[PDB]
From Swiss-Prot:
It comes from Drosophila melanogaster (Fruit fly). Interacts with tacc, dgt6. Interacts with mv. Interacts with Patronin. Disruption phenotype: RNAi-mediated knockdown in the neurons of adult males, significantly reduces survival to 53 percent. Adult survival begins to decrease from approximately day 14 post eclosion. Pan-neuronal or glutamatergic neuron-specific RNAi-mediated knockdown decreases adult climbing behavior. Glutamatergic neuron-specific RNAi-mediated knockdown also decreases activity. RNAi-mediated knockdown reduces radial microtubules in fat body cells, resulting in strong defects in nuclear positioning. No effect on the circumferential microtubules. This is Protein mini spindles. It is found in: Cytoplasm, Cytoskeleton, Microtubule organizing center, Centrosome; Cytoplasm, Cytoskeleton, Spindle; Cytoplasm, Cytoskeleton, Microtubule organizing center; Cytoplasm, Perinuclear region. Belongs to the TOG/XMAP215 family. Binds to the plus end of microtubules and regulates microtubule dynamics and microtubule organization. Function in neurons is essential for adult survival, and is important for climbing behavior and activity. Promotes cytoplasmic microtubule nucleation and elongation. May act as a microtubule antipause factor that rapidly catalyzes the transition from pause to either growth or shrinkage. Involved in mitotic spindle elongation. Involved in the establishment of cell polarity and mitotic spindle orientation in neuroblasts. Residues 1-227 are annotated as: Association with microtubule lattice. HEAT repeats lie at residues 1-33, 34-71, 81-119, 154-191.
Length: 227
């Protein structure tokens, strides 16, 4: 369904043709057959399944590759299977200075095209298996914002268990991002949420309580996504 002239451009040694081929693909990503079976998978496979795929060396080609994956999610029926295939690489890019925001918008499109629950689970699960603190905190930052955007469409029990791990990080940036997420959760879950943290070390508990105080009386924004 792609002509070899785009397919070839995509694997060109010259990043300038890859840029063209990618952007080319991106410009027309709009109007493939939304009823073709597995069209979403075919299109996302074309960017991820080749080489170097999402191991792009050129930051700008990568940027537009992320943009393709996002657009496919927005425009076509997406399976959790297609998400599984690429999401871990996307999550890793959360810590990329230049491409982090574009990786996050892929995650958001994945969540809207499937379910927030499914993607948050995959995101936090991988963030913890993985071992860079920046990916961890950036993952909490994304889940935080997604709760604001989608509403609390999550299971509180496991979510509290996840943010508990982050709140007990030796890394202060991860801690702060997890604690901030507690703040956001309190807008949906109420004062009772604080009881799940009532037995943390004084220092930590004090920090959580501060953020909890700033948020628990606040009325949450109407969801802007997933509606």
């Amino acid at each position: 369904i792609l002509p070899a002239e785009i397919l070839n451009g995509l694997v060109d040694s010259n990043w300038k043709n890859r840029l063209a081929a990618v952007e080319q693909l991106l410009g027309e990503i709009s109007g493939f057959d939304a009823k073709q079976a597995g069209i979403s998978q075919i299109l996302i496979r074309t960017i991820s399944g080749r080489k170097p795929g999402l191991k792009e060396m050129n930051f700008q080609v990568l940027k537009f590759k992320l943009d393709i994956i996002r657009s496919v999610a927005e425009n076509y029926p997406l399976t959790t299977t297609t998400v599984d295939l690429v999401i871990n690489e996307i999550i890793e890019k959360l810590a990329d200075a230049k491409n982090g925001a574009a990786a996050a918008d892929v995650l958001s499109a994945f969540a809207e095209a499937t379910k927030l629950e499914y993607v948050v689970g995959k995101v936090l699960s991988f963030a913890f298996e993985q071992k860079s603190p920046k990916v961890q905190s950036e993952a909490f930052n994304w889940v935080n914002r997604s709760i604001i955007e989608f509403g609390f469409q999550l299971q509180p029990k496991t979510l509290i268990e996840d943010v508990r791990k982050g709140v007990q990080s030796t890394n202060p940036t991860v801690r702060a991002s997890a604690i901030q997420m507690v703040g956001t959760m309190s807008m949906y879950m109420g004062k009772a949420l604080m009881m799940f943290f009532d037995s943390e070390k004084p220092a930590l508990k004090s920090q959580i309580q501060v953020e909890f105080d700033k948020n628990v009386g606040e009325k949450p924004p109407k969801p802007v996504r997933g509606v």
